[PDB]
PDB file of N, CA and C in Angstrom:
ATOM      1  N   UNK A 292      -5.080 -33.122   2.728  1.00 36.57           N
ATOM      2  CA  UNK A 292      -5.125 -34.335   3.539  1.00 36.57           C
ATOM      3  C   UNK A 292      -5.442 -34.003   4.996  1.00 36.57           C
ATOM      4  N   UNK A 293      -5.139 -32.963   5.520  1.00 34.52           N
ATOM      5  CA  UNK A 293      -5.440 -32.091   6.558  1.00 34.52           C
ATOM      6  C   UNK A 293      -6.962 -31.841   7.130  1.00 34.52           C
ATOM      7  N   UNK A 294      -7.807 -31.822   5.718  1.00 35.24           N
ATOM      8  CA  UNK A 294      -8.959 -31.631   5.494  1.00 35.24           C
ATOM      9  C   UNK A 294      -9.408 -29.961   5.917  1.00 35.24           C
ATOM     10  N   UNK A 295      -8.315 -29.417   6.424  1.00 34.88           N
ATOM     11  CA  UNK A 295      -8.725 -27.858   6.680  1.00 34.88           C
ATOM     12  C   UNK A 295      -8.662 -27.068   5.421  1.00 34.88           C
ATOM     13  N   UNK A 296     -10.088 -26.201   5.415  1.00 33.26           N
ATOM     14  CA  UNK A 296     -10.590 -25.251   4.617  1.00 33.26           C
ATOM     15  C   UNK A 296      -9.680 -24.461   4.495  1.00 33.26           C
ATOM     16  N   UNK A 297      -9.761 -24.359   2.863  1.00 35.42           N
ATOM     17  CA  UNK A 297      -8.358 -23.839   1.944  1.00 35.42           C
ATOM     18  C   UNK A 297      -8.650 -22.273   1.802  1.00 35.42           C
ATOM     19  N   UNK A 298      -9.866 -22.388   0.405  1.00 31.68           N
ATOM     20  CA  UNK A 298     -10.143 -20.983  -0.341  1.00 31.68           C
ATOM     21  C   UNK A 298     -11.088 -20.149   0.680  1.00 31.68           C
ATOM     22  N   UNK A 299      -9.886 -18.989   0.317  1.00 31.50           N
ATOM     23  CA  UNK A 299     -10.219 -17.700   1.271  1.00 31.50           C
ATOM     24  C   UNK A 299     -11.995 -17.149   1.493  1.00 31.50           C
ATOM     25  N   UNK A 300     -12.754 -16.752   2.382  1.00 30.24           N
ATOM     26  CA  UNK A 300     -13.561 -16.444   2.697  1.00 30.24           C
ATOM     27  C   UNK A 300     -13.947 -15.228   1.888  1.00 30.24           C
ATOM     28  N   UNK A 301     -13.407 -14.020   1.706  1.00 33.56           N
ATOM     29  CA  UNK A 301     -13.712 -13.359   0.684  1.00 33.56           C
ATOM     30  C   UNK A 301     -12.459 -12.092   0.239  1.00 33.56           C
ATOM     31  N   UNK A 302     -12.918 -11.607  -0.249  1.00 34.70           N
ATOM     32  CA  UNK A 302     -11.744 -10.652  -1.125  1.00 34.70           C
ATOM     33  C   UNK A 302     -11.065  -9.637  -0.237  1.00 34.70           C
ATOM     34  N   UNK A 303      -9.703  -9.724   0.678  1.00 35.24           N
ATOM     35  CA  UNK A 303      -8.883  -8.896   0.933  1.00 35.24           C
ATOM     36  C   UNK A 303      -8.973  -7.381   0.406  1.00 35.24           C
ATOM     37  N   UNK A 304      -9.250  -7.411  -1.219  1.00 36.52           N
ATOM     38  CA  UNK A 304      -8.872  -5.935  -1.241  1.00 36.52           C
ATOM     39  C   UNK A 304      -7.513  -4.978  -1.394  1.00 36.52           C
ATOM     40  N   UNK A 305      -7.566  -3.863  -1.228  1.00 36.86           N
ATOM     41  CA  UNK A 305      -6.056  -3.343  -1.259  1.00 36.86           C
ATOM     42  C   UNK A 305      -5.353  -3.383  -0.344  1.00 36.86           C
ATOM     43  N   UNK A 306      -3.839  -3.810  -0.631  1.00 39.92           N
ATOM     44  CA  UNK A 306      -3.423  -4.274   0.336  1.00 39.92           C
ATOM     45  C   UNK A 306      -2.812  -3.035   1.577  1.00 39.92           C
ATOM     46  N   UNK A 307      -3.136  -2.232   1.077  1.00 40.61           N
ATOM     47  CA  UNK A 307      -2.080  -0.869   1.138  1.00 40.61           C
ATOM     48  C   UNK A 307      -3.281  -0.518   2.501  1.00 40.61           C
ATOM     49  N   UNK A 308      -4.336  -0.828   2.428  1.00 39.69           N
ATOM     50  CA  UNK A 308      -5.552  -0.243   2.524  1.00 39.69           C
ATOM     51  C   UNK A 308      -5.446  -0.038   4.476  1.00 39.69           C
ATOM     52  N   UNK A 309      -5.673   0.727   5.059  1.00 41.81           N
ATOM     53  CA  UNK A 309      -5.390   0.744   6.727  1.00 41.81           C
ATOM     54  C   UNK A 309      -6.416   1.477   7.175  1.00 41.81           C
ATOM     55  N   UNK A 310      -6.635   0.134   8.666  1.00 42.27           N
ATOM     56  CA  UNK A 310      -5.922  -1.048   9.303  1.00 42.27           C
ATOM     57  C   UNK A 310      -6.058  -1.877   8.470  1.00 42.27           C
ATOM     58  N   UNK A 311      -4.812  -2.878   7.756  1.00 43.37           N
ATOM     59  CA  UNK A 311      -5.297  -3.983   7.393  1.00 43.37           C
ATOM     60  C   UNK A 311      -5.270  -5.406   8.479  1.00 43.37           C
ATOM     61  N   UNK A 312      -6.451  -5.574   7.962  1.00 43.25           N
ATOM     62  CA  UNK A 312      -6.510  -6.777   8.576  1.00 43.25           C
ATOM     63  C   UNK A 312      -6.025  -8.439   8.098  1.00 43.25           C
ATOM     64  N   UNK A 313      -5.188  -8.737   8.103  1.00 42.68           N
ATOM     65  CA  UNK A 313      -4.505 -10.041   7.603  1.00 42.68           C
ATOM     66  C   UNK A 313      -5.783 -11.306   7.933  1.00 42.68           C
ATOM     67  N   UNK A 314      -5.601 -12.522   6.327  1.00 38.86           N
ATOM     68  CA  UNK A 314      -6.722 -13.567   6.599  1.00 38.86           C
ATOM     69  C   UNK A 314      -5.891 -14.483   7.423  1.00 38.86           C
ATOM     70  N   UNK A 315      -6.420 -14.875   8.400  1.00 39.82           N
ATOM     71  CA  UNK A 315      -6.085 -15.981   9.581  1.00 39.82           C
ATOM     72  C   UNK A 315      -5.475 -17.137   8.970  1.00 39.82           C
ATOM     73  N   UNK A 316      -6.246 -18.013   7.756  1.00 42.07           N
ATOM     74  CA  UNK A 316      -6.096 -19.012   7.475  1.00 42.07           C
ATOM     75  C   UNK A 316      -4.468 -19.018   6.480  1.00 42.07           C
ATOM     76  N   UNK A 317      -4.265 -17.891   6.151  1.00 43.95           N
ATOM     77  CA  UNK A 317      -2.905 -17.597   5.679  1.00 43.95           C
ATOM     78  C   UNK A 317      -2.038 -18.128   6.728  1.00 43.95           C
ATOM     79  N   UNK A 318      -2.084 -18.208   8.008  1.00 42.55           N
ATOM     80  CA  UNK A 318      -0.941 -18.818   9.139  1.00 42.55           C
ATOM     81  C   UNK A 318      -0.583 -19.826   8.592  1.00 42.55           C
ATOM     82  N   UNK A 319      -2.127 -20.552   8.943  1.00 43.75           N
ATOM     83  CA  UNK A 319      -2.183 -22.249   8.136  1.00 43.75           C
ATOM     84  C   UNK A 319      -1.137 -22.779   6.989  1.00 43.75           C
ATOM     85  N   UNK A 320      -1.217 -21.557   6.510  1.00 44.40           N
ATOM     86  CA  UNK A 320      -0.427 -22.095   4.986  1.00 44.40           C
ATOM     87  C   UNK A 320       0.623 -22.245   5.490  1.00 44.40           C
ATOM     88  N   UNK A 321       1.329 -21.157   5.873  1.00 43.75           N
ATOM     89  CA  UNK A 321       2.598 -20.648   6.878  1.00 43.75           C
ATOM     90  C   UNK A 321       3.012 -21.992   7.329  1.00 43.75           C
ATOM     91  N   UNK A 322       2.188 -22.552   8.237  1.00 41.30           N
ATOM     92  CA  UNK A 322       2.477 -23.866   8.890  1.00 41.30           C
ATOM     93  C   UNK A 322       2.665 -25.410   7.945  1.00 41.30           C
ATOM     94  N   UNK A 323       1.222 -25.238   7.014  1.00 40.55           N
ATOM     95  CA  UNK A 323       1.831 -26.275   6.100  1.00 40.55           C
ATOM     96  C   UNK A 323       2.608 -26.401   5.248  1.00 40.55           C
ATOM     97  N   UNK A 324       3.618 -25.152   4.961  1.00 43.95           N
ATOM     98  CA  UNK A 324       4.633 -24.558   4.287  1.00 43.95           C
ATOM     99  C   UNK A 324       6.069 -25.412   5.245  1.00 43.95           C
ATOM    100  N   UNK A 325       6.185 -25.100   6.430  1.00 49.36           N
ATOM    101  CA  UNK A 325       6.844 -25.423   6.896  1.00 49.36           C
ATOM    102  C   UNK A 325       7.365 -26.765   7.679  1.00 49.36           C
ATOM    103  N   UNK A 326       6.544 -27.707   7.765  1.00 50.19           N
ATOM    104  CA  UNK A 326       6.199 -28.578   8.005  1.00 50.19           C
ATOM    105  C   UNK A 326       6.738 -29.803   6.861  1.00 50.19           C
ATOM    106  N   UNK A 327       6.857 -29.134   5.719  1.00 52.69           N
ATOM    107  CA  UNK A 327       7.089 -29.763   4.439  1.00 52.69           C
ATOM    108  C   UNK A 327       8.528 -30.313   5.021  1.00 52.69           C
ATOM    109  N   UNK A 328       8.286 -31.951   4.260  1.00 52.90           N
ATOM    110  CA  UNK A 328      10.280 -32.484   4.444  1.00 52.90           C
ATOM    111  C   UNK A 328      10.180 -33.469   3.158  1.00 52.90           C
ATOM    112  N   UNK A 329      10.567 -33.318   2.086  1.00 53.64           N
ATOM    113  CA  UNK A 329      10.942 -33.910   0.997  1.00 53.64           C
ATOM    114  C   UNK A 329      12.308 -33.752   0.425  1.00 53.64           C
ATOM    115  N   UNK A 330      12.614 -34.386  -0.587  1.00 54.83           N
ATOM    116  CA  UNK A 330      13.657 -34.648  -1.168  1.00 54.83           C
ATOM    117  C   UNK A 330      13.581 -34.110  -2.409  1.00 54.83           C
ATOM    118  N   UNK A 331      14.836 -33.443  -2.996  1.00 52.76           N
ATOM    119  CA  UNK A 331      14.998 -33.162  -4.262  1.00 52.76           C
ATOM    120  C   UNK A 331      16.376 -32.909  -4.724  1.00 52.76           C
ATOM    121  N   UNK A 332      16.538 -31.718  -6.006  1.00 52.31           N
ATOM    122  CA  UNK A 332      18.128 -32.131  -6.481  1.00 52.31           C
ATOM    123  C   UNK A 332      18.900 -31.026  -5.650  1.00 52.31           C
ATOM    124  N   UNK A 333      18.455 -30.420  -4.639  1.00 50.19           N
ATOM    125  CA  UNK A 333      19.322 -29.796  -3.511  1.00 50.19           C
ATOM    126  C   UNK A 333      19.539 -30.629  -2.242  1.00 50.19           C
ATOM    127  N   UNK A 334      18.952 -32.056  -2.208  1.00 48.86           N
ATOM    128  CA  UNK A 334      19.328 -32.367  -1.390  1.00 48.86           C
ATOM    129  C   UNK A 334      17.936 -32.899  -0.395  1.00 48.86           C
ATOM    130  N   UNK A 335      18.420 -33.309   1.281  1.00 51.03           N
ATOM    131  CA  UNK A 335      16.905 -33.483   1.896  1.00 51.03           C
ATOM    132  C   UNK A 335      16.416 -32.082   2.795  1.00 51.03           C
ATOM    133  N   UNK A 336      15.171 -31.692   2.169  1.00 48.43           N
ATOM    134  CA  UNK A 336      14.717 -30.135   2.182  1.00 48.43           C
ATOM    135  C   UNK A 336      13.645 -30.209   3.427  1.00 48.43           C
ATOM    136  N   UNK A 337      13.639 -29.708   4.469  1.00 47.60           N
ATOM    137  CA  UNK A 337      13.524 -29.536   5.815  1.00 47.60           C
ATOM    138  C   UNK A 337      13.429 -28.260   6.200  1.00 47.60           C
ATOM    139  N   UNK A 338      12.803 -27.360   7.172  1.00 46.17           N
ATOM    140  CA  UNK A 338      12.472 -26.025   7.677  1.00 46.17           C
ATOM    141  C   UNK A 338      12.315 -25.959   9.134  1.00 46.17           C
ATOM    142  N   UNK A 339      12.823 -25.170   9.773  1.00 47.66           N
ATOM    143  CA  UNK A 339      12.494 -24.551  11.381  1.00 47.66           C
ATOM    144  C   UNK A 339      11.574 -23.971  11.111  1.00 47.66           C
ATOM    145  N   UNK A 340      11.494 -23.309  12.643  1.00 50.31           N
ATOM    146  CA  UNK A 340       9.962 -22.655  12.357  1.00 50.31           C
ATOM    147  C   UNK A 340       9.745 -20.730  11.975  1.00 50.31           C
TER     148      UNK A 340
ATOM    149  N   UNK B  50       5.886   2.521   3.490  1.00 46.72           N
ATOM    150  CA  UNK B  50       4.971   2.975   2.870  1.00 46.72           C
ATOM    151  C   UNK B  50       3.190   3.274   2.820  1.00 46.72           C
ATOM    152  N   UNK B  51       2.947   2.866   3.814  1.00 46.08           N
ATOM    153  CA  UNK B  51       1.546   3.192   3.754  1.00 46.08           C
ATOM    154  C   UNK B  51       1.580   4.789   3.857  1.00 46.08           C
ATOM    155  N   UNK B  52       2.335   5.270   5.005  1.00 47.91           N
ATOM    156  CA  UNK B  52       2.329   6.987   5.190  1.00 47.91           C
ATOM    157  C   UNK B  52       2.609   7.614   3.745  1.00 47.91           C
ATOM    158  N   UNK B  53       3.953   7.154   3.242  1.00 48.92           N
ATOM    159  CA  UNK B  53       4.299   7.774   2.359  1.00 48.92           C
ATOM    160  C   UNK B  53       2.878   7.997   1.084  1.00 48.92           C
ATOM    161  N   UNK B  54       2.378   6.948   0.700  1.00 48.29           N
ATOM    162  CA  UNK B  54       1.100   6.787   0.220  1.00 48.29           C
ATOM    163  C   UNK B  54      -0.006   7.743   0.126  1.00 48.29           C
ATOM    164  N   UNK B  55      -0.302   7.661   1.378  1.00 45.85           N
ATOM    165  CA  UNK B  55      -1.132   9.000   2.143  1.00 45.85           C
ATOM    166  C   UNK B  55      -0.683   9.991   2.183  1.00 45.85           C
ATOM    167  N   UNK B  56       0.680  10.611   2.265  1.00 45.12           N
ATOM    168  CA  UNK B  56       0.861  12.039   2.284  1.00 45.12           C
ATOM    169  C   UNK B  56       0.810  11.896   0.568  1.00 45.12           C
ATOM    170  N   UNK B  57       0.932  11.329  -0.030  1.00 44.63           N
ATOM    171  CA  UNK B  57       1.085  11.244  -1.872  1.00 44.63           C
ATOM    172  C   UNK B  57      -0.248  11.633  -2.268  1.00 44.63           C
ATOM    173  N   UNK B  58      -1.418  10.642  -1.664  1.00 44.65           N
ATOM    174  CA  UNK B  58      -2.830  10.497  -2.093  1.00 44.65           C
ATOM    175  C   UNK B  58      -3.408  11.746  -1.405  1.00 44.65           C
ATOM    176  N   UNK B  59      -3.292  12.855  -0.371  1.00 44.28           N
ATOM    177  CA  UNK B  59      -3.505  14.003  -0.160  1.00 44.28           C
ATOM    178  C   UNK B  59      -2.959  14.993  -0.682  1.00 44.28           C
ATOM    179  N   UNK B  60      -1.671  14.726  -2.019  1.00 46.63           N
ATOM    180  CA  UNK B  60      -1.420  15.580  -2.737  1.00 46.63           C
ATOM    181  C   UNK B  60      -0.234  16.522  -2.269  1.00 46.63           C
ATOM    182  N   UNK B  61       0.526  16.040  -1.431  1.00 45.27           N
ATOM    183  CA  UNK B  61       1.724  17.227  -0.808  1.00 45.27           C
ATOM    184  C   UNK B  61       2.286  17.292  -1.802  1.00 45.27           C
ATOM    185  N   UNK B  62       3.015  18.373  -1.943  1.00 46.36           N
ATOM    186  CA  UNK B  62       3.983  19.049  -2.850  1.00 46.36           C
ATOM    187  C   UNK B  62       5.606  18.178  -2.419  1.00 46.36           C
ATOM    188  N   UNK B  63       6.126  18.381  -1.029  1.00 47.42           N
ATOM    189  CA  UNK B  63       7.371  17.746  -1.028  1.00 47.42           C
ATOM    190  C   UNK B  63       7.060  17.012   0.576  1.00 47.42           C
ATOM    191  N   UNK B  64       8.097  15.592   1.017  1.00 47.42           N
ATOM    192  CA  UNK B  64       8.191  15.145   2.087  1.00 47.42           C
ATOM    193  C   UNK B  64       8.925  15.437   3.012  1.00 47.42           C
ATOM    194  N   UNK B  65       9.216  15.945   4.217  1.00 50.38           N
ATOM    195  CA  UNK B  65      10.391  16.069   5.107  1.00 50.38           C
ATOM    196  C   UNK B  65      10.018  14.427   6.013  1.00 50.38           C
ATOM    197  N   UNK B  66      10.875  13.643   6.474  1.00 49.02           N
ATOM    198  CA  UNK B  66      10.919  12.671   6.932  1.00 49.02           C
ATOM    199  C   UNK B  66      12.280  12.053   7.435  1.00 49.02           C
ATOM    200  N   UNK B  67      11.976  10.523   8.197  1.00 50.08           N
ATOM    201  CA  UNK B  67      13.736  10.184   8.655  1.00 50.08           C
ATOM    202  C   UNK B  67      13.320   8.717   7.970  1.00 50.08           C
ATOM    203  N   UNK B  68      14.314   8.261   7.660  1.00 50.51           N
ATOM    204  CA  UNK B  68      14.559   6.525   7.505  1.00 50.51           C
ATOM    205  C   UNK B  68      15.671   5.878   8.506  1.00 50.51           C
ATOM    206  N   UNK B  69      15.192   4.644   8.446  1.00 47.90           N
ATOM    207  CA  UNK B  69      16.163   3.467   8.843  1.00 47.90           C
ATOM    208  C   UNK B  69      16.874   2.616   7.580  1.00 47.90           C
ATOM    209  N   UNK B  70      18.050   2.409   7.793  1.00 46.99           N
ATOM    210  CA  UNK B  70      18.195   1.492   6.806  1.00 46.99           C
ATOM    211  C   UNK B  70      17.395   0.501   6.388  1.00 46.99           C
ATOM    212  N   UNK B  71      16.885  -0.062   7.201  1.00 48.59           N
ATOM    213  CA  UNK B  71      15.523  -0.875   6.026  1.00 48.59           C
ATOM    214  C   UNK B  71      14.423  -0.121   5.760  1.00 48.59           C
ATOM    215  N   UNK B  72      14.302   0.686   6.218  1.00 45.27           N
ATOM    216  CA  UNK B  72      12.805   1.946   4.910  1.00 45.27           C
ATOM    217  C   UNK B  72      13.829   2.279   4.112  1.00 45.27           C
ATOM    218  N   UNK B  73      15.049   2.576   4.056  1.00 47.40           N
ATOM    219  CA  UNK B  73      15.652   3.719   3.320  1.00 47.40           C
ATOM    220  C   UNK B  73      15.606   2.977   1.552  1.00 47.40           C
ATOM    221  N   UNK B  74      15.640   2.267   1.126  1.00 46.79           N
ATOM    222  CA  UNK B  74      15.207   1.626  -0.388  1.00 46.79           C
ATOM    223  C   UNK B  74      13.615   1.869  -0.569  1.00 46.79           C
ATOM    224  N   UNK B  75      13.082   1.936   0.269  1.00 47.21           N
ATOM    225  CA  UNK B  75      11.596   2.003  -0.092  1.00 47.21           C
ATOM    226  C   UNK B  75      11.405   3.281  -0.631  1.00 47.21           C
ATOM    227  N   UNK B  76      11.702   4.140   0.524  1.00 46.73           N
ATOM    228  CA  UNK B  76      11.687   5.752   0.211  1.00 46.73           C
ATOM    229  C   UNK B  76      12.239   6.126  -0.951  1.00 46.73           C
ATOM    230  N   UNK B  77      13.419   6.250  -1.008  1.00 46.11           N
ATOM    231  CA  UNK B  77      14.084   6.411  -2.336  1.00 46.11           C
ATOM    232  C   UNK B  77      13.476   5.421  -3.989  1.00 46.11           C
ATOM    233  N   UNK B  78      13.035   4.213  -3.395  1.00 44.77           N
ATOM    234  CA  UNK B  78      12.883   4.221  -5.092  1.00 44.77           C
ATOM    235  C   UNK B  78      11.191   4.437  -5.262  1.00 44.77           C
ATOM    236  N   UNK B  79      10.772   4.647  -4.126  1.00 44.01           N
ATOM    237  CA  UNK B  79       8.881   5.598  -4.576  1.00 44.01           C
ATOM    238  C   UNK B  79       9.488   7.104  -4.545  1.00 44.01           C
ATOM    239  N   UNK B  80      10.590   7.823  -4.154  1.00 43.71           N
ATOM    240  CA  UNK B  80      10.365   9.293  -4.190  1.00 43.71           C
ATOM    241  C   UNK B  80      11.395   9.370  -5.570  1.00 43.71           C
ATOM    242  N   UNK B  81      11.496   8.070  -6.333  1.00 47.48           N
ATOM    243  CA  UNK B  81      12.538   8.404  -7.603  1.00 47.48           C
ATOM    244  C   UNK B  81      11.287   7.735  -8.609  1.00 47.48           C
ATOM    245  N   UNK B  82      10.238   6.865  -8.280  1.00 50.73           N
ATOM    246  CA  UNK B  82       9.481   6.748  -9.013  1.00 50.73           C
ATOM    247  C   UNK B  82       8.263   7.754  -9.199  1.00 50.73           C
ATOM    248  N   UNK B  83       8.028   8.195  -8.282  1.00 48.11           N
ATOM    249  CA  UNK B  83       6.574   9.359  -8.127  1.00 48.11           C
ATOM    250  C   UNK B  83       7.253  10.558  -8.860  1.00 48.11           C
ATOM    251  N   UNK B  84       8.222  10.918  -8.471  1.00 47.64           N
ATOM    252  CA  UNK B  84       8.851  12.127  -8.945  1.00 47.64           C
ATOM    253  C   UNK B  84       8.472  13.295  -7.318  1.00 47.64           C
ATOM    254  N   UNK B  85       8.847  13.011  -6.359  1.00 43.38           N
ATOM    255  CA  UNK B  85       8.354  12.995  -5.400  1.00 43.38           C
ATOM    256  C   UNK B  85       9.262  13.527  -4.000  1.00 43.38           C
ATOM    257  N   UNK B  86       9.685  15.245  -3.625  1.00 45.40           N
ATOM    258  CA  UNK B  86      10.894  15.595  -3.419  1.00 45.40           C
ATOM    259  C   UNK B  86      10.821  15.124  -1.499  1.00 45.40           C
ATOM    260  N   UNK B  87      11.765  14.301  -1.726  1.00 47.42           N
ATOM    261  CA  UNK B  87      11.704  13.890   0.286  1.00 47.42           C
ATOM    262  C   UNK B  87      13.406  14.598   1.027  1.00 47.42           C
ATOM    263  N   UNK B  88      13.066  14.855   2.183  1.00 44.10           N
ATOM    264  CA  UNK B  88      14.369  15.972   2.828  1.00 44.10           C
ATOM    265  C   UNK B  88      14.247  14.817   3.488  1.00 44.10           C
ATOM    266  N   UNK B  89      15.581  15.123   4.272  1.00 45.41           N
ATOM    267  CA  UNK B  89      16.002  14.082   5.176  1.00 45.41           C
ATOM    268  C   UNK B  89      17.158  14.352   6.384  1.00 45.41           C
ATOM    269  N   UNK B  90      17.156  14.062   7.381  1.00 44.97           N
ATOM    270  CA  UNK B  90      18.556  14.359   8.611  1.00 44.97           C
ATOM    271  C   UNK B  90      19.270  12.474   8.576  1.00 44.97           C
ATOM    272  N   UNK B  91      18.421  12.340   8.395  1.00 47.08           N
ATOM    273  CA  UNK B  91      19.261  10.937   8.244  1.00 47.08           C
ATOM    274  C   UNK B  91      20.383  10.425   7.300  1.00 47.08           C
ATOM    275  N   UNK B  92      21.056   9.667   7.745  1.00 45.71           N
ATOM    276  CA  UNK B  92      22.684   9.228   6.845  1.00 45.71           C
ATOM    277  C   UNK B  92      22.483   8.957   5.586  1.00 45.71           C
ATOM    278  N   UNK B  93      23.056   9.687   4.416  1.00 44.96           N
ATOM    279  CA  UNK B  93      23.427   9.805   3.422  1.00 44.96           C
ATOM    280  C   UNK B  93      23.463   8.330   2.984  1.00 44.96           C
ATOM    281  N   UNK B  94      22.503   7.922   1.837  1.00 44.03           N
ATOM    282  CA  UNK B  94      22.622   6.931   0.875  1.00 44.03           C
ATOM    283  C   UNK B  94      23.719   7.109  -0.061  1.00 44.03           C
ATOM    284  N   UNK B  95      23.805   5.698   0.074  1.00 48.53           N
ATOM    285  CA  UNK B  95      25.230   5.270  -1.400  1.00 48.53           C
ATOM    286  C   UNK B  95      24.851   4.921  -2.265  1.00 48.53           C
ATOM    287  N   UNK B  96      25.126   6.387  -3.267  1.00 47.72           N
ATOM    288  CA  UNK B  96      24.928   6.549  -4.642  1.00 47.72           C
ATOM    289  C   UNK B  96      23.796   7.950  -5.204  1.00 47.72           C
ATOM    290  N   UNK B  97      23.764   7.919  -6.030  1.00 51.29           N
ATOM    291  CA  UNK B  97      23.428   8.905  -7.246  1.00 51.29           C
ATOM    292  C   UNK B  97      21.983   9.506  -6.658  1.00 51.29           C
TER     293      UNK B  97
END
């Protein structure tokens, strides 16, 4: 709903692999991860940052 | 673990190294999974 571009640009690779370089748009998720406030059977489910 | 990795993937025979309590599970269960002999000056883990 955001309309920001989801699927990753291309293949990471091993992760082990150094320097790694982390994909940016992973923050994003981070953020729309947290941002989340719904309801369920624990109760009303909410996050800091 | 990335070091540990690399001294593994160059083939050393044994590790001398230090941990912190949060490396210290890492170390120990790759130098109990590799089969993999690591020395240490650092405080004695609890247990076997």
């Amino acid at each position: 709903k955001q309309r920001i571009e989801i699927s990753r640009r291309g293949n990471a690779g091993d992760c082990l692999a150094n320097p790694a370089v982390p994909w940016g748009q992973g923050v994003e998720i981070e953020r729309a991860l947290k941002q989340v406030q719904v309801e369920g059977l624990s109760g009303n489910i909410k996050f800091d940052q | 673990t990335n070091a540990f990795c690399s001294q593994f993937s160059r083939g050393v025979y044994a590790i001398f190294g230090f941990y912190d309590k949060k490396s210290v599970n890492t170390i120990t269960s790759f130098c109990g999974t590799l089969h993999v002999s690591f020395i240490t000056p650092s405080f004695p883990t609890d247990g076997t």
